[PDB]
Amino acid sequence: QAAHLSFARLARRYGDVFQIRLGSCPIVVLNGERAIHQALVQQGSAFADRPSFASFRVVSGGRSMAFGHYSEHWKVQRRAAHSMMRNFFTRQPRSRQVLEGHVLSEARELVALLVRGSADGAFLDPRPLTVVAVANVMSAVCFGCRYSHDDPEFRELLSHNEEFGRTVGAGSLVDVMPWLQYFPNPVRTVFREFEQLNRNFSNFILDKFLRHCESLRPGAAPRDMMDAFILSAEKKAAGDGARLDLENVPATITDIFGASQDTLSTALQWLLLLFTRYPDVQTRVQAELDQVVGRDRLPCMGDQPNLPYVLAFLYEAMRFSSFVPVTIPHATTANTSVLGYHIPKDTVVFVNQWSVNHDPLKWPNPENFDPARFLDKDGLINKDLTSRVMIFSVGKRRCIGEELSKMQLFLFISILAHQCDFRANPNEPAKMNFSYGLTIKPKSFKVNVTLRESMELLD
Ligand code: HEM
């Protein structure tokens, strides 16, 4: 009875567009591509707002770009945030390399713990490990500092991503049923933890913020995204496009660091999950990797176009898993209509991406994981299908770190699959259970990892 599941089901009787009621709020769910594309794209702007939920307000000390409203001040915050994400990567020559180094560097520490903690036929839950590996890629990209996988204070800071999606996830009752805060219950519990975690994240980034600001003297060369945003803001305040104001820099680096670390973490956990539940797909991608990059070195972004199956497994896991089933709730900015239906200004809207990835007609093997589903008659991928998958949303509020997400999940998996073997715990009868909320996170599950060959990952 997962949200995105009921909605897609209610659509088989009331159409793609219809409205539900969560407590006091009547939400209008969008389910198909034409409806999703007609609201978010064609009438994008009418649907580019965020609902006035008290919890959204708590994120990033009240200055979130992801959870804030549509307005001019917001408009430059996003433009400025998207600018950093586009330029930051591919800004200077050899930049791609420094990025790939971080991934390569976390991939090494990641396989090492997985293999070490999997000796003699042992199994271990990969999740905690995958969060730390992805947060470090971004800890270094954003602050220029990575943490020890043993670091408690950091593993703690990142041990609450589930409480975050349960609070803001479409379906959540925290906002729409405030009376639930009046007494003990899971909803009272999650929201209080929610405030607790956002409070910790902000302080974590605030501390780093104040230090980068202090060390960034006149002629100083920025060596971060923190340093990059601060410089830009000082250059903005200091006389004379879209750049952030110093007061908004901590909040926006929080959204940036927070999203990636959560989403990329969740995504990664599915890849290994799928690898262990589909040994054959694991072998094929693991085969193509051997044929193209050779057992002679480890994969790099240069190999991406000669790896049609890897990219295919990538988009199949994306469509099949739909780990971000419904986008961050939207809100209309003006009375509008979609697929005929009237939608009055200031109404909360849910975009069902899962309903576009699981549409029978567009995807024949709807419930079956078929990476070949994206392979062209002669073995190459066809953007026409690969780009038919919806996970990063579309429109004004579409993800700002899409290419980064991709040129990273490709790498983590390329190294891991090329260097390791993943086996599921056979003794586990009942199946994998998940936690629904913004992202679909896998609940506890154990894998066993062994090295195909000697570590050349060691530098
Ligand atoms: C595979 C990983 C990721 C997926 C599937 C994903 C997807 C999404 C989705 C579904 C949204 C909501 C769109 C909407 O409400 O209409 C979004 C928001 C956003 N994403 Fe991502 N994301 C991921 C990675 C990233 C990364 C790496 C960053 C960090 C740079 C990031 C930052 C953002 C931001 C700042 C927003 C809010 C944008 C806005 O409100 O306008 N995401 N993403």
Ligand SMILES: O=c1cc(-c2ccccc2)oc2c1ccc1ccccc12
């Ligand atoms: O701004 C955020 C966006 C996002 C986000 C997540 C998924 C998709 C889009 C945005 O999440 C977070 C954010 C901030 C802090 C978080 C702390 C824990 C877990 C997630 C956080």
